Ligand binder design. Structure first.
Ligand SMILES: OC[C@H]1C[C@@H](Nc2ncnc3cccc(OCc4ccccc4)c23)[C@H](O)[C@@H]1O
Ligand SMILES: [Cl-]
Length: 387
């Protein structure tokens, strides 16, 4: 039979779902993870995609590519492109005003278009889904941010085609989230939805009006450089400082020690979303000194207090652009793992005067969930048109 997948092709991570037997299934990668890093590493012997690629990033920063979504469908002259480049460890070259990522692969200089890199992350998703199902899967719905332009949408589709997928539809990330919560099935009238998407490196606020199951993007706001990784950095600086206080040694200049500490802060942070305390357990952090310490939710919330506050401004702007009051938003949808942070949920909840938030579906997987729902609907429709 004709099966179809839903793929959330995220900036930092990608997720893949399939609607089957009246239920959505989010497919774990061979490593068992329900999301896969949007990383592509070129080494001296092989092309690594997903976790394997991310794991060796410290070791091979120059030829490990991430953030291709920042560059997809963009011109090389784009201001965003020019700014973003200064912060990447891999080379970006200009070809016909089209950005290309130049790396070292099997001892040779090779350049790739952003859609080529994305096509590789989509192949990993196409494969992950085929490993689960037991047969090849090509029909797919791929999601993109609502603000994405036509050039950006075509490049994402181009990546899907290169990856060997028949792209059923390119649908907006916030639309997919609403679909996941079946907000396009509440019947007649207008339904105002606000999507609060906080990722690892981007923040997106989207307001949609769903009238008779039809979706309209009323406003889009956010920070392209704000997310989970900033909270991580706040923890890193707190702990670099703590180390100095405890041992009178500055570990900041040691690339390995700060990377190992960053890794530990990202894990401690996650633990904090579900518990009051989190303990770091780093063996021989710097100069053979183990770093076994603890942090509290309260202290973490303090180290990030201003950052959490900033999320609300984008929300206020979206309300103005959409010409709506706080009371006019029917549903609040959380997307992105960072929305698991209780302070963030509390801040959003307080802003909307105690309104319950849609958070039952995993925030990390809501988009892939909605995309898998749409893929099934479209595949059925395309097939039903045939016979
Ligand atoms: O690129 C994805 C974002 C989301 C962050 N995840 C989380 N942040 C805060 N609390 C969490 C609590 C439980 C689970 C989380 O995320 C798990 C995860 C890890 C990696 C990718 C997707 C989801 C959390 C993650 O650390 C990263 O900053
Ligand atoms: Cl699975």
């Amino acid at each position: 039979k004709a099966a179809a997948i839903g793929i959330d092709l995220g900036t930092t991570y990608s997720c893949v779902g399939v609607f089957q037997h009246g239920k959505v299934e989010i497919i774990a990668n061979d490593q068992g993870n329900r999301t896969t890093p949007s990383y592509v590493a070129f080494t001296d012997t092989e092309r690594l995609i997903g976790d394997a690629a991310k794991n060796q990033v410290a070791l091979n920063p120059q030829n490990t590519v991430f953030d291709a979504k920042r560059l997809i469908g963009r011109k090389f002259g784009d201001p965003v492109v020019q700014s973003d480049m200064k912060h990447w460890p891999f080379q970006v070259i200009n070809d016909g005003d089209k950005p290309k990522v130049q790396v070292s692969y099997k001892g040779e200089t090779k350049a790739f278009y952003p859609e080529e890199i994305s096509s590789m992350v989509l192949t990993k998703m196409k494969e992950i889904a085929e490993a689960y199902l037991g047969y090849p899967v090509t029909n797919a719905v791929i999601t993109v941010p609502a603000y994405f332009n036509d050039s950006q949408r075509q490049a994402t589709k181009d990546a899907g085609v290169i990856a060997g997928l028949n792209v059923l539809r390119i649908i907006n990330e916030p639309t997919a989230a609403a679909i996941a919560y079946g907000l396009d099935r509440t019947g007649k009238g207008e339904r105002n939805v606000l999507i609060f998407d906080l990722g690892g490196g981007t923040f997106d606020v989207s307001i949609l009006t769903i009238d008779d199951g039809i979706f309209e993007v009323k406003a889009t706001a956010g920070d392209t450089h704000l997310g989970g990784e900033d909270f991580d950095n706040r923890l890193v600086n707190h702990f670099v400082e703590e180390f100095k206080r405890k041992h009178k040694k500055d570990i900041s200049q040691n690339k390995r020690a700060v990377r190992r500490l960053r890794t530990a802060c990202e894990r401690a942070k996650r633990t904090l979303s579900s518990s009051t305390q989190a303990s770091l357990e780093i063996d021989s952090l710097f100069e053979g000194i183990d770093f076994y310490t603890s942090i509290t939710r309260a202290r973490f919330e303090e180290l990030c207090s201003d950052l959490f506050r900033s999320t609300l401004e984008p929300v206020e702007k979206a309300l103005r652009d959409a010409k709506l009051d706080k009371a006019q938003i029917h549903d609040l949808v959380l997307v992105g793992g960072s929305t698991r942070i209780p302070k963030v949920q509390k801040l959003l909840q307080d802003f909307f005067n105690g309104r319950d938030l849609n958070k039952s579906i995993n925030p990390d997987e809501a988009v892939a969930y909605g995309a898998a729902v749409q893929a099934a609907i479209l595949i059925k429709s395309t097939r039903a048109a045939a016979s």
